[PDB]
């Protein structure tokens, strides 16, 4: 059972469920009367995206982006290639970026600019996970789930070689599988 | 509250949670030792995809397709345009198609053929919702959640003009909003 | 085809000469640089093909395929990226290749998007240009021909996906649209 | 550019004549049909441009952009669709336009995919063909030139994204690769 590959659980299932419910409540109050559109980057965000949206008692829309790197450029600039762009015209709408994890914040910042260029009336950022230590880009995080140490984690959408996304918790795999 | 726009609940939240858990158990037993890859079509499938995968205690992978219609052709042939193809090479892998709802079964059958052309060792179909009455294509459904009557439903991923995907149940909107 | 055409504005030989001319200029202007031609499908493929073969320099070629978001496109030129370029343009000298410049809205938008990827330099080239229709800043560095505000077809330009293959630039009979 | 070339196999005028010839044949063969040219980027744009302008018929043009899945591509020619065609080809007469046919694996695969969309007819056209390398059925209806098994560049064909713009077909010096 993939859970046996985990050497440590950082955030439990109930901790996750609770926070998502918490964030959903906050966002629900903050976007009352707004025109909320949730946007996340595949594939890791679908987990949090599905959970957060059900926690938001507001009429809202959902869309996704699929990106790819240009190589070294991306690594140091966060500049990425658009593989699947969002279909909903966010012009004049209140967009909330939904991330699974913020690390360097480079790609997030780049995508933020791109989304801005499409004139949304509002543009905020919500993430379930955040690694402050790794932060090497100026990104304002409006909503944040948990600050985790600098380790490679899996679960709740986060994978390693496409596996472990289905774990109900956030944990660290054994080095052997790394 | 979007739930007030609903004139009737067909499948409750607990009914959904229960079935997804049920299906996950079945699939878990059936894919023991297999090389399971879950594939769904955006955007409606992310809800069921996220829930079903967590209900499957097996190492597994997830990927998505994004499609668009060619017009009348699609309507009568199910032939669609690929907007976002799956990234994982499914050659020799046990693929399980994850649908939110099977209606005519036309697009599902078309996409099934395309997926077959990529030589997966196995290719099955799982859906949370199914409208038998509308079925106008020969599609073998291996796993099925609930058979619903011929009505336009929303919730758990299903939308209407991009809204209602975040409802925790499957229901029918009031005709006024239609 | 040559039956729904009200009049021919630019001949095939006219197009060839101008392409050779623009190619020669770019060869001189970009000598010693890391040149990348980026055209916007589908219309730009004729010009892209003819211009690149007329540039006597080592260069790369890539394309963008875009789509409209609705009215947000008509008024602000904001578009959806359906196919992005694969070549990493950071530190490179990019030359946008266009079939025709009109309002300049979409062009202005894509221009900013590419700048977002930090190219060393970014210029714009188009075979056709409709001056009296401009409604966006955008500087055009290389331009083939200035034309009146008529619906033209040919050399890549279509009407309902037709006429792109005409080897000349012609005016479509208004009755056809 | 013309410095890393070991030898020239086909001149620019040679390419032009053949394109005109293939265009004339297709004009005769497809008269009265609903023709749709579909080329595979990036390599096919030169030939696509030259061939379409040499077909004196009303036609449509579209493109496919593909990517590899890994080894599954090398052995079975199975590819990932990065950019699909927008034109609905059902009931239409499609002509796949290729820059070069080698093993024929990817071509065979895309061919089946397009057939899946029920076109009235489906034929294949290529400017270049390497016979001794074929490792897939696939019938070629229109072919420009047969060439030996050498790595060629030019008229759309590249090596590391370079040389597509050469106006002739040349053999790349082995040292360069
Ligand atoms: O600890 C981590 N685990 C998994 N992905 C991470 C982590 N930190 C940052 N990432 C990034 O998360 C992105 C997720 O890609 P996805 O798996 O396709 O959704 C990648 O670009 C990773 O580099
Ligand atoms: O009752 C229904 N509600 C919503 N979508 C439905 C229903 N029955 C069939 N569909 C199809 O579900 C697909 C879902 O598209 P999506 O919303 O982008 O995920 C569409 O092509 C619909 O035609
Ligand atoms: O007279 C004209 N003929 C063809 N295209 C035109 C003309 N004037 C402006 N355009 C632009 O050409 C673009 C071409 O899109 P494409 O056909 O997909 O390459 C359109 O979005 C138009 O806005
Ligand atoms: O000699 C050659 N020069 C260039 N491409 C070749 C040659 N032989 C085979 N090819 C094929 O050309 C394809 C071109 O891809 P493109 O450059 O993206 O258009 C490659 O995937 C190769 O398999
Ligand atoms: Mg992310
Ligand atoms: Mg990942
Ligand atoms: Mg579906
Ligand atoms: Mg829908
Ligand atoms: Mg253009
Ligand atoms: Mg057009
Ligand atoms: Mg080719
Ligand atoms: Mg190549």
Coordinates of C-alpha atoms and ligand atoms in Angstrom, one line a residue, chain A residues 41-42 44-45 98-102 158, ligand 5:
Chain A
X41 CA -2.4 24.3 -12.9
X42 CA -2.7 20.6 -13.8
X44 CA -1.4 18.4 -8.9
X45 CA -4.0 21.1 -8.3
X98 CA -5.5 27.7 -6.8
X99 CA -2.1 26.1 -6.2
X100 CA -1.1 22.8 -4.7
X101 CA 2.3 24.1 -3.5
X102 CA 4.3 27.3 -3.8
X158 CA 1.5 16.1 -5.3
Ligands
LIG5 MG1 1.4 23.9 -8.8

